[PDB]
Amino acid sequence: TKIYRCKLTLHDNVFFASREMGILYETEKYFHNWALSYAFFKGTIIPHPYGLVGQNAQTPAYLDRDREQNLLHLNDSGIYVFPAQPIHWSYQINTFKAAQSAYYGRSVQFGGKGATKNYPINYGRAKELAVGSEFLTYIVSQKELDLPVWIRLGKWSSKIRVEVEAIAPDQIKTASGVYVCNHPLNPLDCPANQQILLYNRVVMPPSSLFSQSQLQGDYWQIDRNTFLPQGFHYGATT
């Protein structure tokens, strides 16, 4: 029922380890929906356990009712964030290191002696999304929503200004047919009574998004040049 046009401005550089090639780790230019859903609603709705230990410390709980860090809490809260479209962007490639806390340091080869386990020993280069960037998302909810005007994202918990407007009922309209979505859209969240006819894809962990799609189903023309899929909810394909 309610729809919020939220534009995200980076107030410091955002890193996600989306792909890795040698010394270089890089960030995809679309913020994945599930990452933004926890950035908005973790602590307010979804639980935020400070510690983990066990299998729960390296296995996601995305869509597992048995665990506390679910995105399904939000299905029951009647809320859905869409993934983020880049409106304006830049990248910085910045090195990062391991600290030499001891007075003496030996450069050790990764996998050598004293280095035989997967940890960030030595150095790497992160291709971060930079302060010079702006992204656009939509949140759809069935209740007026107290959205936080600051969020944190990614590998380094980096600040985003969220400036948000509710799209009023005088300028949205509801319809059904074939439509080009033109915003990003997560295929895992697609229900029955939507079908995807065409898509162009952005290959990305944890699951690939569409950057552009043609759908058949119900939609909201939220301004005269974008069409948002109606009825999407977290994990609806399962």
């Binding site: 510690g51 936080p148 600040k159």
Partner: protein, 320 residues
């Protein structure tokens, strides 16, 4: 002061994050030539000069979260080793090592700044932070200094051949200010004294800290809130605009103008705020924490309790 604030904090570390944030508002003032570099240059980004609707872009120096958090973090671990709460010896039962498998799961550093071993445990950082920015432009805020390394016999030549050991290096200037908000979630009272300790007790940052890089962390306010208040960039763009770009001002005018800009911003940001420690209440609070960090009995007591609380969190809710 501290006797009144003891109500605000959690009585012991919670499992889930509850949304109590104590925010430290600071100006980090450069005192001698820091070098916040990666990739062989001083880190910079283009930004808008200020919040009042400028066309005007400005290259400002960026101190990344790593470059400020790790110097605070490591200055806590050496304090805990000096109090004898943790050890450097591989044969001790209270060993803690900074990054590998040998990280503790109990000590104050591990619970407040976090750890990740793998399946054997991990803990999220309770100290939230942002990348800090120079209040002025890079062109105003740096100078490049030559270095050389001759033979001990005083000469760039040895055996009639020249050393290649000359280059330039880039340095930030001795008055450059980096407005900062550091934020601490869901902390106990002693957790606040440990972290506020790091902010006041650590004094060197960036590369070549053996030779350079002293900074003065001037605390400007402490703010208790239900949520995240504003970014370093947003404070810096507000502070530039409150000055209209006359950046050539003394440290005390720059701190008092930051204290009123912080309160101008806090009135607009939609989170509820329990306490706003500024001015003479901050200067008495700072004296009352300086009095802990100068007293052997008082500090070993508080940090002993912190240890216990974090050792109890570890065994009750943490990585056991």
């Amino acid at each position: 002061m501290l006797d009144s604030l003891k109500s605000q904090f959690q009585p012991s570390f919670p499992r889930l994050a509850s949304g109590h944030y104590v925010h430290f508002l600071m100006l980090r003032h450069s005192q001698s030539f820091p070098v916040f570099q990666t990739d062989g240059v001083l880190n910079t980004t283009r930004t808008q000069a200020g919040l009042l609707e400028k066309t005007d872009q400005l290259s400002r120096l960026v101190m990344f979260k790593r470059k400020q958090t790790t110097p605070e973090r490591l200055a806590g671990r050496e304090l805990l080793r000096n109090l004898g709460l943790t050890s450097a010896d591989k044969s001790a039962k209270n060993l803690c090592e900074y990054n590998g498998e040998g990280s503790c799961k109990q000590c104050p550093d591990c619970i407040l700044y976090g750890f990740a071993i793998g399946d054997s445990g991990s803990e999220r950082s309770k100290v939230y932070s942002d990348s800090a920015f120079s209040l002025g432009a890079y062109e105003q805020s740096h100078r490049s200094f030559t270095f050389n390394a001759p033979f001990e016999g005083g000469t760039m030549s040895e055996a009639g051949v020249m050393r290649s050991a000359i280059n330039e290096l880039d340095h930030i200037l001795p008055e450059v200010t980096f407005p900062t908000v550091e934020s601490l979630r869901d902390a106990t009272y002693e957790g606040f004294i440990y972290v506020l300790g790091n902010l006041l007790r650590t004094k060197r940052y960036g590369a070549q800290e053996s030779r350079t890089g002293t900074m003065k962390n001037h605390l400007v306010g402490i703010v208790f809130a239900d949520g995240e208040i504003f970014s370093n960039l947003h404070l810096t763009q507000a502070l530039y605009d409150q000055m209209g770009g006359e950046l050539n001002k003394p440290i005390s005018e720059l701190c008092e103008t930051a204290a009123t800009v912080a309160q101008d911003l806090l009135n607009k940001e939609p989170v509820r705020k329990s306490e706003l420690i500024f001015g003479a209440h901050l200067d008495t609070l700072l004296q009352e924490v300086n009095d802990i960090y100068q007293n052997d009995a008082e500090l070993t007591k508080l940090l002993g309790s912190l240890y216990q609380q974090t050792q109890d969190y570890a065994t009750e809710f943490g990585a056991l």
